[PDB]
Amino acid sequence: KLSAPLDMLKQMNESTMEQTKLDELRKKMSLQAEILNKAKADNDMFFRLLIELMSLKLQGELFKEQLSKISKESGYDSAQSALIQATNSEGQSPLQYALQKQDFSTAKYFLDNGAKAGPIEKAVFEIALDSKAAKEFGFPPLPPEKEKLHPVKNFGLVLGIKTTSVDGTPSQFGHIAPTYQLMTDSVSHFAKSHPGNKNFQEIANAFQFSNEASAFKFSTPQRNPEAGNDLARRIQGGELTTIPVSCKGHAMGLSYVPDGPGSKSGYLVYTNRGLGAKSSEHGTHIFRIEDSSKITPEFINNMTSGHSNGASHDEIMSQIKAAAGNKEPIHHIKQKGQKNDNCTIANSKSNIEGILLCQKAREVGGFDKLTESDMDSVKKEYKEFTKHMRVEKVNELAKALKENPQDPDLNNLTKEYLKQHPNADPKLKQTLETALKQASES
């Protein structure tokens, strides 16, 4: 019956390349482009035409003909030339784009036309494999081996290290379940080492509640209807509640901060530092919620299952705006842009700075009444948290590297950290350099 899925997996594996090989291929085709000395290709035009083409939902053969025309119209010799070289402003190749959108028919046509699967394409594919669209295409469930967080992602996502494991696994894209668990542990560990910090007792309690009630497996919540009933009830009772939120191939940040226990008003804190947000809006947005009853079980079920149910960014975003009465946010926290990552750590963690802001606003009686020193206090506690999380992960990395001094991944993670964070606290650098020295010991 479903041999198309088997065929696509075969193709994806035949077309696999290491990143450096794929970069060579691309660079060599750039040299050939310069020999011909024809006009420069227009990637933005290609993707515009590509996205229009995909929405027509054409059958394979017509699709492939149209794909040839728009490649040429965009300045490429062929569909294959465009497929191997074009990237959009998010840095996605066409194949990455089709997989991120869970458009497996288009992804397979791209493969038929010679598109290559580097480590990033394969990671985005594995994420897209855990979705209703993947099941309906005939794919099986992911093997349970892939449930564990790869060490290159555990350290890579927390510490911000871009690298690839020796086995091909990039540090960038992660499933929701193990990354939400890692956030829940990081927040809880901080809360426990700082019992006088009342804010973080609330935050740890909220993550623990949502982490358990959502019961993600890979990137699909496992008790969809009930979980949203639980979270909505917690919000209705006026308790700080986090809301795991995703769309196709992307995770955002979302939480509800109550005015007080049993209150009906509070704030909805939304974070997106990456795909789908304009660079000017990268960061965290705080909406005033006058009546929490608009944060319904259905809304929350839609938020948590956004990726598995194939919701688009605009569908999720519009529901978030609806729950806030389509009013504009009252505050924006600008936060560093991210690209080529589904932000399972980035958006969840940066959302906490918005939670802390709202906790301060609550206690001084409103956003009206925040002073400059209040908001510098907020930023100071947020940075105290992210410092704690960073220091523990560097110590964990040094420890791991000394107990397995010959592992290529631990060594390369350690080296790449120092290379990519030159301005790192000297105590962090010291800890990792001494670990690297120790490792070179046979």
Numbering used by the authors: 19 to 460
Paper text:
A Legionella effector LegA15, also known as AnkD, is one of 11 ankyrin repeat–containing effectors in L. pneumophila. The Dot/Icm effector LegA15, a 471–amino acid protein encoded by gene lpg2456 of L. pneumophila Philadelphia, harbors an ankyrin repeat (ANK) domain that is known to mediate protein-protein interactions in eukaryotic cells. LegA15 is a GTPase with a unique catalytic mechanism, unlike any eukaryotic small GTPases. Here, we show that an ankyrin repeat containing effector LegA15 localizes directly in host lipid droplets (LDs), leading to Golgi apparatus fragmentation of the host cells by hijacking the host vesicular transport factor p115.
GDPNP was well defined by its electron density. GDPNP is shown to bind a positive-charged pocket formed by Arg291, Arg408, and Lys367 without inducing a large conformational change of LegA15 because LegA15 in this complex is well aligned to its ligand-free form [root mean square deviation (RMSD) of 1.0 Å]. GDPNP also makes additional interactions with LegA15. The α-phosphate hydrogen bonds with Lys367.
